[PDB]
Amino acid sequence: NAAARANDITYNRLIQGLKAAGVEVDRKNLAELAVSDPAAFTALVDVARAALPEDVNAP
Amino acid sequence: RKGILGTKLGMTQVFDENNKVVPVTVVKAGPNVVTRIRTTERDGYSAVQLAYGEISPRKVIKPVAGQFAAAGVNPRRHVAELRLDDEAAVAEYEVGQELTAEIFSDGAYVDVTGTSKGKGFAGTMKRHGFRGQGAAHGAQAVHRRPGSIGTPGRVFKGTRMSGRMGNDRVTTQNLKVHKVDAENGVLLIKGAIPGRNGGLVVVRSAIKR
Amino acid sequence: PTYTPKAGDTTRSWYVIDASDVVLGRLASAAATLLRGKHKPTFTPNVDGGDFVIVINADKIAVSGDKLTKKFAYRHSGYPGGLRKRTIGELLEKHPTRVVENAIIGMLPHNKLGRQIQKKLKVYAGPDHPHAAQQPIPFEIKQVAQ
Amino acid sequence: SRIGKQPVPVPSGVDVTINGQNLSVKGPKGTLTLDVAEPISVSRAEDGAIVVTRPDDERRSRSLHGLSRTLIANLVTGVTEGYTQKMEIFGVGYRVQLKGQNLEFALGYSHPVLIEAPEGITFAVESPTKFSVSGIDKQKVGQISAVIRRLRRPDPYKGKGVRYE
RNA sequence: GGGGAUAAGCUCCGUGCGUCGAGAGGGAAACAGCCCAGAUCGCCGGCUAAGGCCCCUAAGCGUGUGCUAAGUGGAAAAGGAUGUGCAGUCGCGAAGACAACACUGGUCAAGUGA
RNA sequence: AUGGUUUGGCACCUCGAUGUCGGCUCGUCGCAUCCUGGGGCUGGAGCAGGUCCCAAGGGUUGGGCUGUUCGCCCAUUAAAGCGGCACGCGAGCUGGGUUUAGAACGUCGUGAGACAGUUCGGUCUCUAUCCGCCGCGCGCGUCAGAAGCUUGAGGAAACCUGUC
RNA sequence: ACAGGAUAACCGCUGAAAGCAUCUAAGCGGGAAACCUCUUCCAAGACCAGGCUUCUCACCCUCUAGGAGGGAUAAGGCCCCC
To answer: Which residues form the signal peptide (chain C)?
Structure first.
């Protein structure tokens, strides 16, 4: 959550985008990436942003 | 508000012009020398510091001697502070200026502050004026004990129980100065002022009268 | 295993928050998050890896409703009938910083670690602070849109 | 609401200064300053008047709109001609006169009674029984008038004391 | 359902009713009997139930449309009450409506009453 | 409708022990205010009251009778408040009452005996471990070691009233 | 105690919604032994452990030279003593 808010996205929207994008990395290694390699986490945030719907509140 | 440091000498008897008796306590309002000025711009509060008593120069420790030298006056035994109200009030004192007894006038009302006599470890009967229990009619070894102490099963704070008594700073208010003897630097104050003979006192103009 | 901070890992930065016309609870929560170190990806509940927080214009702070004259700050001396109460109005006009200090302190944990974290909060009623030597970074309370 | 919508005329000879909501007016009788509530703005209409424009119709604003209008009207009429309050006594032995700037009455108390004249008001006493006070602000004049009225408890029996015209 | 004053954390019966007793775990601040769910052991994996997502405290100072001024939310009755939102009626009224200056006339100027 | 201050009802709590009434000593809290303080209408002329709102800062007597609380009475006073807290307080006191064993009267029982009937007498134990509270020190801390004089966040105490 | 501040019941001033009125929803005042100051006392273990000053303001040894340990001193303090 801390690392995602550092990239202007909330944790829940990030998780939904990661699920939609099909990436199957878990929270343990997500935290490992957030602590160790910020560049990979930023790239994952971008791919999750791409995988999200255009209006998340749409029915 | 004027002020001065003095010493309690004892109490005696005098008669006023209506032939009534006045029990007067004699206070040696000896010469005081101003040693330091407390200013708002420097200390945050306005006050004046006075030195009293005569002491041998070989008795003062080096920090005290240095402070007195920086002031510019020879050391004295006792040092105390008078808290004024504003800079306009403290402008009239300057370091090295000498205060003597005549700052007070006859019939003035003064506030003497001293340290009460010591009474040692005192019981509630003496420390707090507790009424005792019966001395007879079956009372068993409770002739002087406090009695009850009185849901939470706790002795609330402030319990007026026995303990050490006396030796506290005390101010007596609205004492009348019967006479200001300028020759001996002696104030004749009607009434009883706190402390034992030879103790330090502070005489201030009354805050109320 | 999971990353754990070592002796020299923690780095602190200084933020200065302008409390003029800011909702008291909002500013208190933001400052509490900053003090706790929740915004750092290296966060760990064991360590106080937070940041120093300076709050200026504490007296200009905003209180909604009629809480200015109806919300009481209580304290008991311990003696019987030692309960004293002041509304936020007199508390603000007498000790302006105390309202913000109390609000921020109530929102961070009540452990010993909370006591150590409290050391890293400085609040001031004036528009300026004596901590210019640290070059604090101005901090603005934004919301991450989802 | 209804009264507020009508702009209050501003005489030519009296200066009106508008600084956001801080409004100051310099008239022949003197100067007075008024602060307007924040949900309402006031702009000096170029035709020799000021506009009390309420942009919302929620209860707070709709109630404050007419109040602001009548407050402005009071301010302008008090800075233009001022305000005058006339007073008097009923009964016997009640004497009133002006002693410089301060007012002294002998209502019958064992002590003389003095009233201090604040700024913006002045006392006129053309008779011991009747007298008047005048000022540039209506609120202050009313407050002092009531204060002087208070010098005797009401008399439903004899009506001895002071009463307005 | 009975007894008691349909009062009791009162008492006595019925129930292919439940739980506790003999039941851990999560929630209700704490909380045998309420809600979710029945623990063979290990994992520094994932999805959910009840309950939740400003900080304490994991996750939303979420989005859209409205309401509340009472800190209501975050305890309670008979009753009282020009609070306010919505909807429905009726009375009067540009022949000038209400106010202001029982019922009638002039000024005035749209709504005014239950 | 409130309260659990009155008698109650339940028997959840204790029978390998939770002292039972008054009184003394010492409290603390509520306000549903007895006095003092500010009010209002008076079926208030003034005096004085009636009644009512605010108000808990302080104060609120000494005796006779009774074990008493309660109560009546005697003198005063500004007033002689109502209540909660194991109907406060017996490892603080009393033992007058109640509540063992002795004895008597009335009444009941054939009798042993009995009576929320009466009468006289009748062992109240303890070296304070912990919390609490009143006082007093030792150690360490407050970024070198010391010494004078102090600011005060924060608390505590006090707050009565009459006559002329 | 005196004096000040904010107030209770209450008395008011200036006036809207609601063309008048209305101590009121905007505002502004008076108003009590209650509250905050004011009086007396404690108070920097107030861990945000405060302030103004004044005094001493330096000498060795060891391990290994990183830090530590030990010794001897200054200002001062304590013990013994009256």
So the answer is: none
